[PDB]
Amino acid sequence: AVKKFKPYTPSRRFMTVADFSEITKTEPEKSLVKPLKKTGGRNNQGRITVRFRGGGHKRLYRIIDFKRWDKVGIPAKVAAIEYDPNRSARIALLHYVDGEKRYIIAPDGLQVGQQVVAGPDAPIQVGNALPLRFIPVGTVVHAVELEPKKGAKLARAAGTSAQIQGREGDYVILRLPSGELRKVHGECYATVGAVGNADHKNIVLGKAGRSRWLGRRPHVRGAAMNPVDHPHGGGEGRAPRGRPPASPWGWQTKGLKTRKRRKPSSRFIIARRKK
Amino acid sequence: MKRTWQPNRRKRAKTHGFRARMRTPGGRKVLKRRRQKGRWRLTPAVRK
RNA sequence: GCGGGGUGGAGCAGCCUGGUAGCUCGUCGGGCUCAUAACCCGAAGGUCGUCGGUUCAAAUCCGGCCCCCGCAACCA
RNA sequence: CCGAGGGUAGGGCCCGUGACUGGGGCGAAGUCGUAACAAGGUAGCUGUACCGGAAGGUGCGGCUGGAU
RNA sequence: UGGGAGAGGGUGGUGGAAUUCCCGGAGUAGCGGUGAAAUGCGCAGAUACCGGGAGGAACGCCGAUGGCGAAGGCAGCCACCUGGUCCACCCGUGACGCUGAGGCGCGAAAGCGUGGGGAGCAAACCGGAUUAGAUACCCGGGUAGUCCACGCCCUAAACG
RNA sequence: CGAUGUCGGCUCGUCGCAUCCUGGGGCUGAAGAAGGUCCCAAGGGUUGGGCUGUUCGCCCAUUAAAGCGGCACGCGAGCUG
RNA sequence: GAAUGCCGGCAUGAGUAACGAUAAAGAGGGUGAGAAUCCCUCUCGCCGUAAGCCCAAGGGUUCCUACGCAAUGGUCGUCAGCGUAGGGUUAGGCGGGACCUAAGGUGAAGCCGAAAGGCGUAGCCGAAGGGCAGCCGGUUAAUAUUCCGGCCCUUCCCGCAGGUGCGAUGGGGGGACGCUCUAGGCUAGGGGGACCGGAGCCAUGGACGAGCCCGGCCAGAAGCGCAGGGUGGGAGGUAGGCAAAUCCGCCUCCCAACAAGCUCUGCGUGGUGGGGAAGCCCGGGUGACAACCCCCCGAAGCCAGGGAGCCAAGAAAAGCCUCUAAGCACAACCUGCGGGAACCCGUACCGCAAACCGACACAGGUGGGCGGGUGCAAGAGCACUCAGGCGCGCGGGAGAACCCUCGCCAAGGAACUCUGCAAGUUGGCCCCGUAACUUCGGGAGAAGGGGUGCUCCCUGGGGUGAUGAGCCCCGGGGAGCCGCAGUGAACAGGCUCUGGCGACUGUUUACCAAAAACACAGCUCUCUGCGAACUCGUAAGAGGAGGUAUAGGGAGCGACGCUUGCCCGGUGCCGGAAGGUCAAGGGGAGGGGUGCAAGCCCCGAACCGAAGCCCCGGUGAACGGCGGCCGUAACUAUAACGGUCCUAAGGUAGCGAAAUUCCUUGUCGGGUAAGUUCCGACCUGCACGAAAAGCGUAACGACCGGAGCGCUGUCUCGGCGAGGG
RNA sequence: GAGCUAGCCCUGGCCAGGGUGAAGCUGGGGUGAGACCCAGUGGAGGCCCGAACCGGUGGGGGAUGCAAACCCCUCGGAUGA
RNA sequence: UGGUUCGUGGAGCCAUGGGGGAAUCUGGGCGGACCACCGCCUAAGGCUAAGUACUCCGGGUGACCGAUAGCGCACCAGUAC
Ligand SMILES: [Mg+2]
Ligand SMILES: [Mg+2]
Ligand SMILES: [Mg+2]
Ligand SMILES: [Mg+2]
Ligand SMILES: [Mg+2]
Ligand SMILES: [Mg+2]
Ligand SMILES: [Mg+2]
Ligand SMILES: [Mg+2]
Ligand SMILES: [Mg+2]
Ligand SMILES: [Mg+2]
Ligand SMILES: [Mg+2]
Ligand SMILES: [Mg+2]
Ligand SMILES: [Mg+2]
Ligand SMILES: [Mg+2]
Ligand SMILES: [Mg+2]
Ligand SMILES: [Mg+2]
Ligand SMILES: [Mg+2]
Ligand SMILES: [Mg+2]
Ligand SMILES: [Mg+2]
Ligand SMILES: [Mg+2]
Ligand SMILES: [Mg+2]
Ligand SMILES: [Mg+2]
Ligand SMILES: [Mg+2]
Ligand SMILES: [Mg+2]
Ligand SMILES: [Mg+2]
Ligand SMILES: [Mg+2]
Ligand SMILES: [Mg+2]
Ligand SMILES: [Mg+2]
Ligand SMILES: [Mg+2]
Ligand SMILES: [Mg+2]
Ligand SMILES: [Mg+2]
Ligand SMILES: [Mg+2]
Ligand SMILES: [Mg+2]
Ligand SMILES: [Mg+2]
Ligand SMILES: [Mg+2]
Ligand SMILES: [Mg+2]
Ligand SMILES: [Mg+2]
Ligand SMILES: [Mg+2]
Ligand SMILES: [Mg+2]
Ligand SMILES: [Mg+2]
Ligand SMILES: [Mg+2]
Ligand SMILES: [Mg+2]
Ligand SMILES: [Mg+2]
Ligand SMILES: [Mg+2]
Ligand SMILES: [Mg+2]
Ligand SMILES: [Mg+2]
Ligand SMILES: [Mg+2]
Ligand SMILES: [Mg+2]
Ligand SMILES: [Mg+2]
Ligand SMILES: [Mg+2]
Ligand SMILES: [Mg+2]
Ligand SMILES: [Mg+2]
Ligand SMILES: [Mg+2]
Ligand SMILES: [Mg+2]
Ligand SMILES: [Mg+2]
Ligand SMILES: [Mg+2]
Ligand SMILES: [Mg+2]
Ligand SMILES: [Mg+2]
Ligand SMILES: [Mg+2]
Ligand SMILES: [Mg+2]
Ligand SMILES: [Mg+2]
Ligand SMILES: [Mg+2]
Ligand SMILES: [Mg+2]
Ligand SMILES: [Mg+2]
Ligand SMILES: [Mg+2]
Ligand SMILES: [Mg+2]
Ligand SMILES: [Mg+2]
Ligand SMILES: [Mg+2]
Ligand SMILES: [Mg+2]
Ligand SMILES: [Mg+2]
Ligand SMILES: [Mg+2]
Ligand SMILES: [Mg+2]
Ligand SMILES: [Mg+2]
Ligand SMILES: [Mg+2]
Ligand SMILES: [Mg+2]
Ligand SMILES: [Mg+2]
Ligand SMILES: [Mg+2]
Ligand SMILES: [Mg+2]
Ligand SMILES: [Mg+2]
Ligand SMILES: [Mg+2]
Ligand SMILES: [Mg+2]
Ligand SMILES: [Mg+2]
Ligand SMILES: [Mg+2]
Ligand SMILES: [Mg+2]
Ligand SMILES: [Mg+2]
Ligand SMILES: [Mg+2]
Ligand SMILES: [Mg+2]
Ligand SMILES: [Mg+2]
Ligand SMILES: [Mg+2]
Ligand SMILES: [Mg+2]
Ligand SMILES: [Mg+2]
Ligand SMILES: [Mg+2]
Ligand SMILES: [Mg+2]
Ligand SMILES: [Mg+2]
Ligand SMILES: [Mg+2]
Ligand SMILES: [Mg+2]
Ligand SMILES: [Mg+2]
Ligand SMILES: [Mg+2]
Ligand SMILES: [Mg+2]
Ligand SMILES: [Mg+2]
Ligand SMILES: [Mg+2]
Ligand SMILES: [Mg+2]
Ligand SMILES: [Mg+2]
Ligand SMILES: [Mg+2]
Ligand SMILES: [Mg+2]
Ligand SMILES: [Mg+2]
Ligand SMILES: [Mg+2]
Ligand SMILES: [Mg+2]
Ligand SMILES: [Mg+2]
Ligand SMILES: [Mg+2]
Ligand SMILES: [Mg+2]
Ligand SMILES: [Mg+2]
Ligand SMILES: [Mg+2]
Ligand SMILES: [Mg+2]
Ligand SMILES: [Mg+2]
Ligand SMILES: [Mg+2]
Ligand SMILES: [Mg+2]
Ligand SMILES: [Mg+2]
Ligand SMILES: [Mg+2]
Ligand SMILES: [Mg+2]
Ligand SMILES: [Mg+2]
Ligand SMILES: [Mg+2]
Ligand SMILES: [Mg+2]
Ligand SMILES: [Mg+2]
Ligand SMILES: [Mg+2]
Ligand SMILES: [Mg+2]
Ligand SMILES: [Mg+2]
Ligand SMILES: [Mg+2]
Ligand SMILES: [Mg+2]
Ligand SMILES: [Mg+2]
Ligand SMILES: [Mg+2]
Ligand SMILES: [Mg+2]
Ligand SMILES: [Mg+2]
Ligand SMILES: [Mg+2]
Ligand SMILES: [Mg+2]
Ligand SMILES: [Mg+2]
Ligand SMILES: [Mg+2]
Ligand SMILES: [Mg+2]
Ligand SMILES: [Mg+2]
Ligand SMILES: [Mg+2]
Ligand SMILES: [Mg+2]
Ligand SMILES: [Mg+2]
Ligand SMILES: [Mg+2]
Ligand SMILES: [Mg+2]
Ligand SMILES: [Mg+2]
Ligand SMILES: [Mg+2]
Ligand SMILES: [Mg+2]
Ligand SMILES: [Mg+2]
Ligand SMILES: [Mg+2]
Ligand SMILES: [Mg+2]
Ligand SMILES: [Mg+2]
Ligand SMILES: [Mg+2]
Ligand SMILES: [Mg+2]
Ligand SMILES: [Mg+2]
Ligand SMILES: [Mg+2]
Ligand SMILES: [Mg+2]
Ligand SMILES: [Mg+2]
Ligand SMILES: [Mg+2]
Ligand SMILES: [Mg+2]
Ligand SMILES: [Mg+2]
Ligand SMILES: [Mg+2]
Ligand SMILES: [Mg+2]
Ligand SMILES: [Mg+2]
Ligand SMILES: [Mg+2]
Ligand SMILES: [Mg+2]
Ligand SMILES: [Mg+2]
Ligand SMILES: [Mg+2]
Ligand SMILES: [Mg+2]
Ligand SMILES: [Mg+2]
Ligand SMILES: [Mg+2]
Ligand SMILES: [Mg+2]
Ligand SMILES: [Mg+2]
Ligand SMILES: [Mg+2]
Ligand SMILES: [Mg+2]
Ligand SMILES: [Mg+2]
Ligand SMILES: [Mg+2]
Ligand SMILES: [Mg+2]
Ligand SMILES: [Mg+2]
Ligand SMILES: [Mg+2]
Ligand SMILES: [Mg+2]
Ligand SMILES: [Mg+2]
Ligand SMILES: [Mg+2]
Ligand SMILES: [Mg+2]
Ligand SMILES: [Mg+2]
Ligand SMILES: [Mg+2]
Ligand SMILES: [Mg+2]
Ligand SMILES: [Mg+2]
Ligand SMILES: [Mg+2]
Ligand SMILES: [Mg+2]
Ligand SMILES: [Mg+2]
Ligand SMILES: [Mg+2]
Ligand SMILES: [Mg+2]
Ligand SMILES: [Mg+2]
Ligand SMILES: [Mg+2]
Ligand SMILES: [Mg+2]
Ligand SMILES: [Mg+2]
Ligand SMILES: [Mg+2]
Ligand SMILES: [Mg+2]
Ligand SMILES: [Mg+2]
Ligand SMILES: [Mg+2]
Ligand SMILES: [Mg+2]
Ligand SMILES: [Mg+2]
Ligand SMILES: [Mg+2]
Ligand SMILES: [Mg+2]
Ligand SMILES: [Mg+2]
Ligand SMILES: [Mg+2]
Ligand SMILES: [Mg+2]
Ligand SMILES: [Mg+2]
Ligand SMILES: [Mg+2]
Ligand SMILES: [Mg+2]
Ligand SMILES: [Mg+2]
Ligand SMILES: [Mg+2]
Ligand SMILES: [Mg+2]
Ligand SMILES: [Mg+2]
Ligand SMILES: [Mg+2]
Ligand SMILES: [Mg+2]
Ligand SMILES: [Mg+2]
Ligand SMILES: [Mg+2]
Ligand SMILES: [Mg+2]
Ligand SMILES: [Mg+2]
Ligand SMILES: [Mg+2]
Ligand SMILES: [Mg+2]
Ligand SMILES: [Mg+2]
Ligand SMILES: [Mg+2]
Ligand SMILES: [Mg+2]
Ligand SMILES: [Mg+2]
Ligand SMILES: [Mg+2]
Ligand SMILES: [Mg+2]
Ligand SMILES: [Mg+2]
Ligand SMILES: [Mg+2]
Ligand SMILES: [Mg+2]
Ligand SMILES: [Mg+2]
């Protein structure tokens, strides 16, 4: 669910917040957190290289496990489900019988107290991890590796999920959350289910301040600038674009494709995203 | 109102200091010029 | 001031490339119908805004004048 | 003390009237089309939705109060 | 107490036929559509044909002048959860009944909100014809919507 | 053009007379009262408001009358803006 | 002799403006060649959430004393932050270092770059963060948590004793964390006392009094008491915490659990040491054997790493405890005690300012802590006042115009003016009472009105006590008294109606613009499958992001409601393996220079040969665009209808003389005595129109219009008065 | 040259007092169960009034200034972007 | 592509970033596209005085300056500020 407010201030009228129903532990596992080096959007030159960033709430980075083939055959109990400020999804605390504790992204349906496991033999049940080739075609899956032993790269955002469409040789065919049809390697691990917190997108920030909390500084339109600043800049009074609409750096921004043509991974993408 | 000189010794030394000058090719040249001119103080005096 | 027009009753071609005025509509005569509209078959009507000129000959090229359309009339 | 009433302020209901405007009724010798009554020339009617100078049209579902 | 019939309702699964799109093979001069045409599609290889894949929606024969529900309404198949109802036995209760101003719920289609989905169909809209005109009827396209979830709307030739 | 600050208002005036008023006249289609028209006359006077930045103009209520112009469209080393 | 020339000197304005906050002065005594200005006394005024006090920056001897007054001081000067000289800063415990890390900086490894140089995990550096052992008083002209006095504590070295598998840069625990609100118990600080101590006073009509005035504490080891914080104990298994591990993690069992225990802190007491007023007398002496007590208020501070709630989910590392490895177990470490050892730098003074930043002894700026009392609902507000500090480094007169800042005004009350600009009014608190509209929160302190002091009597509830006395807090009900006036002074909304624009709180042209502009939640288009797109850099490497399509970039639009039409010819973007054009290169028909020759050398047709362009198609919340003429209806008028030309298609809804309307003060209506403005209408819209969004919208605005009430020197129309000039 | 100014990063600090009273929770009512309503408790918020503090709306003064942006009155924010 | 007087010119020579890629005296470069002839020279390794440039320093000499000159400084100047 999402939680609405009564309109006792102009902003609380439209503001909505997460329900936090699935959360069972409001404290991070101390040995799994490290400080998050905030950037402000600036690179090693001190130069802003992504605009309009900074001033967000301080965060502690949780160390998440995106390999999971790291501990094949050793089951684990789901001790708690926690809030993670560095992602849209929720995270699950895993207490391995091994005695090791690691975080995974919390799938939808994952119950606190239940047990999960990784490996070619794993039961096809929510929260288990297997190479793609050992997962039944048609079952939905998340946290998918793109290449073997390189870590979960696909379907990690709240509510996302990939789906297996069929097999072809060493590779299997996934339909990524964007709808793109892609061949991913059979040995790539993935975790069955969809990501939890699917309600994430129905949140209405509600006021200028909330975006500021999220480290999102105000964004300024090209049209509201000057000819030095932006292609859309200047003009007496208000003004339309007067040219094909562009980024501050000059390139066209309505329709213009940007994926590199001669990219080697083209051979593995079957159907570019719908819509 | 607040004027432009707001003294701070750490700032002064870490900026126009001797070690600062020696670290950069441009700064070493400052010292060369100042010595060649015969300046009594190659670097801003600051009381640490 | 700069550009563009005036041709059967209406609206448009023809002008640039001189000779050769065309299309739709309307109009008159006759068909079909009880009659009417539609429809079919026939026919009439423009001397091309004018006045001048070039030429063998001017709706056509050129000039004067009338009229209408559009743009401009800024720094002050 | 209460007190006719006068005064100040803010409410409620009613009536009259108002540039302009919405449709309604009648008038009728105007204009445009022909939606309905026959299978009315696309069976009609219907709730709803969108559209059109206008009757109306169309989509969706419904009724026969529909000919053959 | 014992028995029956049924598209009654809800949730989760699931089966085949067909349309569409996509990939491959093979193949060539048209296909489509109509009263007749045209728009449209097709030598940039369409139609028609075989193989594969994807996706949505509706369930042909059974099917009925049938069944079920208070009405709206309900149809492939399976399972679970659940309402109404009829029969037989004539065992139990002892008039505990009927109707019902308000109230409450349910309420086809279209329509609205948020998020999915989107094959076919199809308001609006575009084009081709017909026509005096054709903001229509016919044809080629086509967006909402039609589908799912949750929440609204509460109308009707909601009719026997 | 090595600067002559530019509308209107306020303030303070001063002059011109082609005189709005008041004074004096001739003619009148001047009965009277009131007007018309021209002549003489610059001594004084020449109101308060609504609209608009306005000057101007329209309008209200009065008035003997509600005059027109010059002074760098008088006046920003006087004010306003 | 001229260059608004250059450098210097000296004039003019002129004995003129000014002499730097309107907190303010007056006399007496002293000093001295000289005194409004220096010293002393008394009187007067000003600050007191400071104009007092204590830190940190920064300044760098300005500190203290002696002797001076040429210059500095906006006057004067005997004085001074000035001249000369002499003196003055004392730490194992305060701050920094011999500790730790943060951003960042630097940088073994490694990577990159013409050179210079740019990167870079570790490591190192880097603090106002973590860590860490001193409190009260006394003393100097000047330093003190630094010297002295009392009472405490830390580490290091060594030795003794008891104890133990000791041992680490390695493993683990811990350190270790947000915002808001908050409990119990305390302390700081404060108020009162009929109680305790004290020099004294009795005036001027009264008072020898429960009279007045002054003061009634500070620090303190162990022990203890009160209040908090932290923490389960035992055993078995073990494959995880890059070796090991008895530790930690995980699983099972037993006992304990809102108990305790154990441990750490706060507060109280505490052996002991300190201080100790008014007044009087010359900083000190005295008071004084000073007293050192009870009650109440009470923190934002302490116990603390406490509690609850919420979402935006809230540093690291060392010290510290535990584990074990090499090693070594004559060692080593722990615990207790003893002796010895304990280094470098700062320390003066100013510090909201005459010592810092502003050229000045400059009405400006500058971070943290303390900041008393009474009254006013509260308070860090306001008035007065304590402690302390001041009267601002030119004065004395006079009583013009005029200026500034201020007070009052007859009758009128916006007639002022671009405009109520300005100044009035309103003003705090309690009660009563509040409309359209609305997103149901609001609008709202709407509007409007009543009350407000003091006195006596009666009475209700809470805190602290004890359940009572006293004290403190919140009231209620009667009968009265005085004044023009009871938030009696000071601090403290004028209100309503109605349009435009922007939803809103916010942001902006530092120094002529705070707005309607920017941003904003929210909507849409588009790009991006991750070594992502994109951005910075030549590169390496970075950001994006330790993120992964519910995510990230670009753009437009701008809460929300109802909506967002038609045009793909042109431009752009997207798709299109055909065809056309197409560069290097391939190819070499054929031709040439040359040589006696083989040969060497040059040119070169056909054909093959990318992107891009052409060509085909799509695409509007892509760039953009969205007609002309003529006719027609029972009188006119207009034209639902028709004709025709052009176009890629000819502006749909809605709105409209508008932030847009030229003609224009359009026309009509409202409001006014009068309305170029304003509002409501009309529609021949010069030249609105649908995300450079269209039309509305409650609430909001130091935005921009119009109107009314209230009230005023804005005005008729000026007058008087005050203070600084 | 970022000791002024702009943004961001690390680490600290500051915001008197008063006012309005969201969700939640508890109890009562309500129903078949509910939704819901009511009271109490609670203490939310780019909420309200107003110091510090951050500003700089209007006017007046200042203009060889006290000041190369100041002063007086007035006014905006003041738990948050 | 640079260098040469040589700016694509008939453009050789010297140098070399990319591609291809030999030979050892019958070997190879050059004499301004190219060929022949005639001549010159020995690439792909290194060193090498002197003649030449300069004036911080020392000296000598001026139809050079003489304190607004001559060095920025005759003087406690790269100082005061
Ligand atoms: Mg949920
Ligand atoms: Mg809400
Ligand atoms: Mg709420
Ligand atoms: Mg709600
Ligand atoms: Mg509100
Ligand atoms: Mg609001
Ligand atoms: Mg969330
Ligand atoms: Mg969240
Ligand atoms: Mg919630
Ligand atoms: Mg949740
Ligand atoms: Mg936390
Ligand atoms: Mg850690
Ligand atoms: Mg990190
Ligand atoms: Mg980081
Ligand atoms: Mg760095
Ligand atoms: Mg740099
Ligand atoms: Mg750098
Ligand atoms: Mg960027
Ligand atoms: Mg940024
Ligand atoms: Mg999360
Ligand atoms: Mg969203
Ligand atoms: Mg959304
Ligand atoms: Mg954040
Ligand atoms: Mg954004
Ligand atoms: Mg923006
Ligand atoms: Mg702009
Ligand atoms: Mg720039
Ligand atoms: Mg440029
Ligand atoms: Mg540009
Ligand atoms: Mg532009
Ligand atoms: Mg612009
Ligand atoms: Mg423009
Ligand atoms: Mg602009
Ligand atoms: Mg302009
Ligand atoms: Mg414009
Ligand atoms: Mg603009
Ligand atoms: Mg704008
Ligand atoms: Mg433009
Ligand atoms: Mg353009
Ligand atoms: Mg790949
Ligand atoms: Mg600073
Ligand atoms: Mg300094
Ligand atoms: Mg410093
Ligand atoms: Mg410092
Ligand atoms: Mg330095
Ligand atoms: Mg020296
Ligand atoms: Mg110097
Ligand atoms: Mg230097
Ligand atoms: Mg002309
Ligand atoms: Mg022609
Ligand atoms: Mg011809
Ligand atoms: Mg002739
Ligand atoms: Mg002729
Ligand atoms: Mg002819
Ligand atoms: Mg111009
Ligand atoms: Mg009476
Ligand atoms: Mg019909
Ligand atoms: Mg009909
Ligand atoms: Mg019909
Ligand atoms: Mg029509
Ligand atoms: Mg239609
Ligand atoms: Mg019938
Ligand atoms: Mg059937
Ligand atoms: Mg019986
Ligand atoms: Mg319904
Ligand atoms: Mg809808
Ligand atoms: Mg579709
Ligand atoms: Mg037509
Ligand atoms: Mg639609
Ligand atoms: Mg829709
Ligand atoms: Mg029915
Ligand atoms: Mg029926
Ligand atoms: Mg029936
Ligand atoms: Mg001039
Ligand atoms: Mg001059
Ligand atoms: Mg007479
Ligand atoms: Mg008469
Ligand atoms: Mg006169
Ligand atoms: Mg005169
Ligand atoms: Mg006028
Ligand atoms: Mg009269
Ligand atoms: Mg003038
Ligand atoms: Mg004049
Ligand atoms: Mg002036
Ligand atoms: Mg003027
Ligand atoms: Mg003048
Ligand atoms: Mg003037
Ligand atoms: Mg102006
Ligand atoms: Mg001369
Ligand atoms: Mg000069
Ligand atoms: Mg001069
Ligand atoms: Mg003078
Ligand atoms: Mg002064
Ligand atoms: Mg004063
Ligand atoms: Mg003196
Ligand atoms: Mg003297
Ligand atoms: Mg006080
Ligand atoms: Mg100094
Ligand atoms: Mg001192
Ligand atoms: Mg002196
Ligand atoms: Mg003197
Ligand atoms: Mg003297
Ligand atoms: Mg002096
Ligand atoms: Mg003097
Ligand atoms: Mg001075
Ligand atoms: Mg001495
Ligand atoms: Mg000591
Ligand atoms: Mg040492
Ligand atoms: Mg370190
Ligand atoms: Mg430190
Ligand atoms: Mg210390
Ligand atoms: Mg220390
Ligand atoms: Mg101590
Ligand atoms: Mg021993
Ligand atoms: Mg031990
Ligand atoms: Mg942590
Ligand atoms: Mg901390
Ligand atoms: Mg008190
Ligand atoms: Mg005390
Ligand atoms: Mg206690
Ligand atoms: Mg183990
Ligand atoms: Mg004694
Ligand atoms: Mg005694
Ligand atoms: Mg507080
Ligand atoms: Mg806590
Ligand atoms: Mg670290
Ligand atoms: Mg040492
Ligand atoms: Mg000291
Ligand atoms: Mg100050
Ligand atoms: Mg200054
Ligand atoms: Mg002074
Ligand atoms: Mg008060
Ligand atoms: Mg008060
Ligand atoms: Mg105040
Ligand atoms: Mg004074
Ligand atoms: Mg003074
Ligand atoms: Mg008066
Ligand atoms: Mg009045
Ligand atoms: Mg009045
Ligand atoms: Mg006004
Ligand atoms: Mg007051
Ligand atoms: Mg009202
Ligand atoms: Mg209400
Ligand atoms: Mg009131
Ligand atoms: Mg009294
Ligand atoms: Mg006062
Ligand atoms: Mg107020
Ligand atoms: Mg109002
Ligand atoms: Mg207006
Ligand atoms: Mg608006
Ligand atoms: Mg605004
Ligand atoms: Mg704005
Ligand atoms: Mg907005
Ligand atoms: Mg805003
Ligand atoms: Mg605010
Ligand atoms: Mg400004
Ligand atoms: Mg400026
Ligand atoms: Mg500036
Ligand atoms: Mg400036
Ligand atoms: Mg400026
Ligand atoms: Mg301004
Ligand atoms: Mg503002
Ligand atoms: Mg804006
Ligand atoms: Mg919107
Ligand atoms: Mg770049
Ligand atoms: Mg990198
Ligand atoms: Mg990265
Ligand atoms: Mg990263
Ligand atoms: Mg990301
Ligand atoms: Mg905006
Ligand atoms: Mg196109
Ligand atoms: Mg187009
Ligand atoms: Mg264009
Ligand atoms: Mg072909
Ligand atoms: Mg081709
Ligand atoms: Mg050949
Ligand atoms: Mg165009
Ligand atoms: Mg457009
Ligand atoms: Mg077309
Ligand atoms: Mg249309
Ligand atoms: Mg209009
Ligand atoms: Mg008007
Ligand atoms: Mg308008
Ligand atoms: Mg405008
Ligand atoms: Mg306009
Ligand atoms: Mg105009
Ligand atoms: Mg107008
Ligand atoms: Mg006008
Ligand atoms: Mg007029
Ligand atoms: Mg008028
Ligand atoms: Mg009109
Ligand atoms: Mg735009
Ligand atoms: Mg647009
Ligand atoms: Mg509007
Ligand atoms: Mg509404
Ligand atoms: Mg405003
Ligand atoms: Mg006056
Ligand atoms: Mg007076
Ligand atoms: Mg006076
Ligand atoms: Mg005076
Ligand atoms: Mg800065
Ligand atoms: Mg700054
Ligand atoms: Mg309450
Ligand atoms: Mg609660
Ligand atoms: Mg509150
Ligand atoms: Mg607030
Ligand atoms: Mg406030
Ligand atoms: Mg101001
Ligand atoms: Mg004012
Ligand atoms: Mg004033
Ligand atoms: Mg002034
Ligand atoms: Mg001021
Ligand atoms: Mg002020
Ligand atoms: Mg605040
Ligand atoms: Mg506050
Ligand atoms: Mg906060
Ligand atoms: Mg705020
Ligand atoms: Mg040449
Ligand atoms: Mg050459
Ligand atoms: Mg080469
Ligand atoms: Mg040879
Ligand atoms: Mg050879
Ligand atoms: Mg060679
Ligand atoms: Mg040669
Ligand atoms: Mg040679
Ligand atoms: Mg030699
Ligand atoms: Mg040599
Ligand atoms: Mg000489
Ligand atoms: Mg000299
Ligand atoms: Mg000299
Ligand atoms: Mg020299
Ligand atoms: Mg000199």
Side-chain angles (χ1 to χ4, degrees), chain A residues 84-107:
Chain A
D84 189 353
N86 310 101
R87 48 190 39 85
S88 42
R90 304 306 195 211
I91 56 175
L93 216 213
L94 294 190
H95 285 179
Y96 281 69
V97 288
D98 205 15
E100 192 164 5
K101 304 184 180 192
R102 313 236 271 241
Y103 278 120
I104 62 160
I105 9 192

Side-chain angles (χ1 to χ4, degrees), chain A residues 95 116 186 192 199 219 234-235 240:
Chain A
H95 285 179
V116 286
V192 359
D199 250 342
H219 195 116

Side-chain angles (χ1 to χ4, degrees), chain A residues 34 44-45 53 83 87 99 153 180 223 252-253 259:
Chain A
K34 50 182 171 189
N44 61 17
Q45 302 173 336
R53 306 280 269 237
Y83 182 99
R87 48 190 39 85
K153 300 292 187 239
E180 160 179 303
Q252 220 149 309
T253 184
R259 173 181 225 274

